From a paper:
Using a phenotypic assay monitoring the degradation of the immune adapter TASL, we identify feeblin, a chemical entity which inhibits the nucleic acid-sensing TLR7/8 pathway activating IRF5 by disrupting the SLC15A4-TASL adapter module. Investigating the mechanistic involvement of SLC15A4, we recently discovered the protein TASL, encoded by an SLE-associated gene previously known as CXorf21, as an interactor essential for IRF5 activation. Through a C-terminal pLxIS motif, TASL acts as signaling adapter mediating recruitment of IRF5, in analogy to the key immune adapters MAVS, STING and TRIF for IRF3. As our previous data had shown that interfering with SLC15A4-TASL complex formation abolished TLR-induced IRF5 activation, this suggested a strategy to target the pathway with high specificity. Conveniently, TASL is regulated by proteostatic interaction with SLC15A4, so that interfering with complex formation alone leads to efficient degradation of TASL protein.
C5 is an elongated molecule comprised of an aromatic 2-(4-ethoxyphenyl)-quinoline moiety followed by an amide bond and an aliphatic 2-methyl-1-propylpiperidine. Finally, we resolved the structure of dimeric SLC15A4/C5 complex at an overall resolution of 2.50 Å. The dimeric SLC15A4/C5 complex adopts an outward-open conformation and surface electrostatics analysis revealed that the outward-open cavity is negatively charged. We found an extra density at the bottom of this cavity which was identified as a C5 molecule in each protomer of the SLC15A4/C5 complex. C5 binding occurs at the canonical substrate binding site within the large family of proton-coupled oligopeptide (POT) transporters, where dipeptides are seen interacting in the human SLC15A1 and SLC15A2 cryo-EM structures. Assisted by the high-resolution map, we finally determined that the bound C5 molecule within the cavity adopts an L-shaped binding pose, which was coordinated by several interactions at the interface of the N- and C-bundles, including electrostatic and hydrophobic interactions. SLC15A4 did not undergo a significant conformational change after binding with C5 and only subtle movement of the sidechains of the C5 binding pocket residues was observed.
Residue numbers in the entry:
A (entry chain B), B (entry chain A): 18 to 135, 150 to 248, 313 to 356, 361 to 520, 525 to 558
The structure:
Amino acid sequence: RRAAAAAAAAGAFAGRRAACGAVLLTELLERAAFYGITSNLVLFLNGAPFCWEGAQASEALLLFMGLTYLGSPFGGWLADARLGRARAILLSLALYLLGMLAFPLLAAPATRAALCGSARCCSPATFAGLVLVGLGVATVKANITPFGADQVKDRGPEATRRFFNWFYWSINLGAILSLGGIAYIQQNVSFVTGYAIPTVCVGLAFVVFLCGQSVFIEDVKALVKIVPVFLALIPYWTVYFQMQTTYVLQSLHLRIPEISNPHTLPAAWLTMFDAVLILLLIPLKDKLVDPILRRHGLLPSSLKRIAVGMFFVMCSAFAAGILESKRLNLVKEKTINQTIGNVVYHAADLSLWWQVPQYLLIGISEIFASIAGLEFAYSAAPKSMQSAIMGLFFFFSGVGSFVGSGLLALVSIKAIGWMSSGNINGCYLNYYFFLLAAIQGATLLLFLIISVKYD
Amino acid sequence: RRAAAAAAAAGAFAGRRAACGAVLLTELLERAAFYGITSNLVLFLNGAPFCWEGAQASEALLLFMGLTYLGSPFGGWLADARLGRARAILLSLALYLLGMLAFPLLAAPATRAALCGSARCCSPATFAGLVLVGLGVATVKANITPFGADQVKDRGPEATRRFFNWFYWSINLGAILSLGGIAYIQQNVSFVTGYAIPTVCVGLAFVVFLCGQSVFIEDVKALVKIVPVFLALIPYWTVYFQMQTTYVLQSLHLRIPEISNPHTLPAAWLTMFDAVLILLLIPLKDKLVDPILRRHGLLPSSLKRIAVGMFFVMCSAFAAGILESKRLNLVKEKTINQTIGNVVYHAADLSLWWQVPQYLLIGISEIFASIAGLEFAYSAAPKSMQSAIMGLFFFFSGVGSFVGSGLLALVSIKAIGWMSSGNINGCYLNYYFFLLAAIQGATLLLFLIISVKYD
Ligand SMILES: CCOc1ccc(-c2cc(C(=O)NCCCN3CCCC[C@H]3C)c3ccccc3n2)cc1
Ligand SMILES: CCOc1ccc(-c2cc(C(=O)NCCCN3CCCC[C@H]3C)c3ccccc3n2)cc1
Ligand SMILES: CC(C)CCC[C@@H](C)[C@H]1CC[C@H]2[C@@H]3CC=C4C[C@@H](O)CC[C@]4(C)[C@H]3CC[C@]12C
Ligand SMILES: CC(C)CCC[C@@H](C)[C@H]1CC[C@H]2[C@@H]3CC=C4C[C@@H](O)CC[C@]4(C)[C@H]3CC[C@]12C
Ligand SMILES: CC(C)CCC[C@@H](C)[C@H]1CC[C@H]2[C@@H]3CC=C4C[C@@H](O)CC[C@]4(C)[C@H]3CC[C@]12C
Ligand SMILES: CC(C)CCC[C@@H](C)[C@H]1CC[C@H]2[C@@H]3CC=C4C[C@@H](O)CC[C@]4(C)[C@H]3CC[C@]12C
Ligand SMILES: *[C@@H]1O[C@H](CO)[C@@H](O)[C@H](O)[C@H]1NC(C)=O
Ligand SMILES: *[C@@H]1O[C@H](CO)[C@@H](O)[C@H](O)[C@H]1NC(C)=O
């Protein structure tokens, strides 16, 4: 029947292995270079060559992250009006290499005096490197997501679903290689070697495209029809980025095992726990949910898969507040010392691996909501305005990130006092996970109404 | 359009006010007589005239409740094969009056010696009264639910939806008048007056029918298509009846305010808290969800409204375990004494009205799942086999009640120890609400697959 014709299209890519594989390898090397900057930027700026304060190093990363979301609609509109796609990603990866090159030069003591030898020490050389990398990320993310799906666009809307499974797989594989390997080198071996590795990862990502150019391939009503879907995701992004911040804070105050008898393991390894599960669950989805949910006709659309992923975000926030209520009860009796990075944390005597049911549930959530979110921004976009809708899709991702940071500033005031105090043992973090479960539950009920009124 | 034609049918009952109103008043007086027996049966049998043990009084109520679920398919098949509907409810309410009459006779000291004057003291007079009342409830519930919807069956499947709103409203109104008024009289005034009131409520329910007779009005494939829906509700009934038991246990160990300066308020008032909210939320649904969800085309089917009600059961179980973790933390510091019934309870100094967010969520759940559950058992039944499907619908309601009681026996063993100990301050009741949230969440995901594969 029609289910057999869709399962026949599941045998996809069919000759376009080098066309799609050049896109997967480019984004694998671009995510490997993004977490080369983001993981140890504050440790680098608040260090021995640069004597910046802790607030000035954190506000430099906050303006860097916000520039990767603010520049996405402009980096995608420029790929529609003036340039193409492939000329816009080659232009951006050239600028993403130029700003990236300043970080091995500032790390080296020989080349540091050439840039800024004669409050902030080297602010013209540092902030100029953050602008070119930040505008490089925003233009790539807006443009590499439709362009990779344009190769398998010919084989229906089901082959593009299988592309975003392995596109989101190589994003997480590039994050494991950067947060695991490169972030270990930047803290314990050298910043000179540790920033030269992601700069080579940009240059290889530029070469894979020039080697890969040989194999590559009513609307006003369509704009106002999809803006209420993106506005309904702003409370979803709020819960999403505040789990990434606060599950790491729960991991720091929990008993982390030691690995050897270069010491003092990085704090970027605690952000890997989400992405390790995604490497295990995408081959599980691609081989047991592309078959199984298709020949039973179950859950075919992209907007209903976002609502499934919203269900496992809420179940993760409950499982986090249950563990945090147990941990705050257990930290009153005894408290052990552990050092993560270069600061000691007062951890309870409860194992780190009790945080695994939190990461299964946001793991399963990104299996559904994150891959189908890329499918909706691609399919529900006009042909002239693709990658400018991807630009707005990651702009409202950043709007939810800053209103989530303002939510943490709201529960930190003296009137509420949930986050009044690097120690959270006097904070009520479990009450904040229960608030995120209530915001996510109201977001789920709101999104189901928007999803039906969209169709 | 078609939404205006459905809103025109929302102006329903249209001349059949006395036909439906005789059915609403009969079930109001039948629920008032059911909780006249159930609320203080154990206190009556374990009392001054009858010297039964606490186990023998509880097993008499457990065989009584199980007989109201076991006899429902047989009391409804008898209303299809041999008798009609109205001749089956008049026959059952005659037997529901005959067994009910033994309870004022055993309560009175003059007429007690005539029945059983010369282990268990008066077991032939007591168990014979429980059989006729128990078979009377099972035959009425199987038959009064299709028969009331047969009056407004002519005006489409939307007028029957408005019947089960006010049919389920008068069930809860009959429960407030019995658990509030009659259960107060049975414990503090007299059992003679206190059981004579629900016996008059049966006799008035028999007279309203004889006064109301003047105004009243492929299938083998249809059986096996709806059995997997009833089997998928067995984990829903498991969580449903175990919340009714364990929210009362949480209310007993929580600070209940006093009302006067007849003392010692009944324990049946703590079961009223669910039904008081239902009296406030059914006029809210009938006047703001029959309009609003209809002209927006939102959530039209009965099986998707059961899945909405399954979502608020799970959110109630989380809100219950969060309050119970706070209460067990607070009971370690200080503990007050309060007497409910005739036994003292060691309550924490936390107010009873913090249990209100638990009862809003199961309140909203019965607004969706309980009314739409009656609609599915009526609409998805063959015309020859109606009220035998209602009989199976309340039989699987009872299967979930006894497998829920076996779940409490499973978490009470020494290997798990969540319910190893009338005191729950040494028990982990919060871990049992979190288990019920996990069973309900897996039931929701199971029911959505069954609901799609049904359609
Ligand atoms: C309902 C909305 O659905 C979503 C749709 C799209 C995306 C999404 C996300 C990213 C990303 O930035 N992924 C981060 C990696 C893993 N990451 C590593 C550190 C710790 C936390 C962990 C999540 C991303 C990147 C590059 C190009 C596209 C991208 N599209 C997410 C959700
Ligand atoms: C997804 C399944 O959906 C449901 C469908 C039907 C029913 C249901 C239920 C009853 C009942 O027995 N209601 C009890 C009253 C209130 N009750 C009073 C004490 C404390 C607890 C509180 C719930 C009932 C009675 C008489 C005729 C029909 C009836 N149909 C329930 C759920
Ligand atoms: C009782 C008070 C709180 C009103 C409750 C309204 C909430 C609880 C209910 C009522 C209307 C419901 C929505 C109506 C719209 C739809 C479309 C339906 O096809 C899928 C479910 C979905 C998304 C429902 C989600 C839950 C919902 C929002
Ligand atoms: C989708 C939403 C509605 C899910 C419900 C979660 C929220 C609203 C529920 C879950 C647990 C509930 C809490 C249960 C226990 C307590 C502790 C008590 O000291 C104050 C009330 C309070 C704080 C309740 C507030 C409301 C509450 C937090
Ligand atoms: C619908 C479902 C997902 C609701 C979630 C309930 C389950 C998955 C959550 C609720 C409470 C959570 C628990 C919170 C506390 C503990 C105690 C600790 O010693 C081991 C982890 C453990 C056991 C967590 C396991 C997962 C957990 C039981
Ligand atoms: C990743 C592992 C746990 C597999 C997860 C399967 C669960 C989480 C998902 C996968 C398939 C999904 C179901 C597929 C069938 C449907 C019909 C769809 O129209 C409504 C939702 C519903 C009812 C889905 C509920 C959630 C569901 C059961
Ligand atoms: C943990 O660190 C604190 C801070 O110096 C110290 O007072 C305490 O003795 C340490 N405890 C252990 C067990 O090392
Ligand atoms: C509560 O009851 C117990 C049981 O007799 C008793 O020991 C205790 O003193 C009582 N406390 C108060 C405050 O009455």
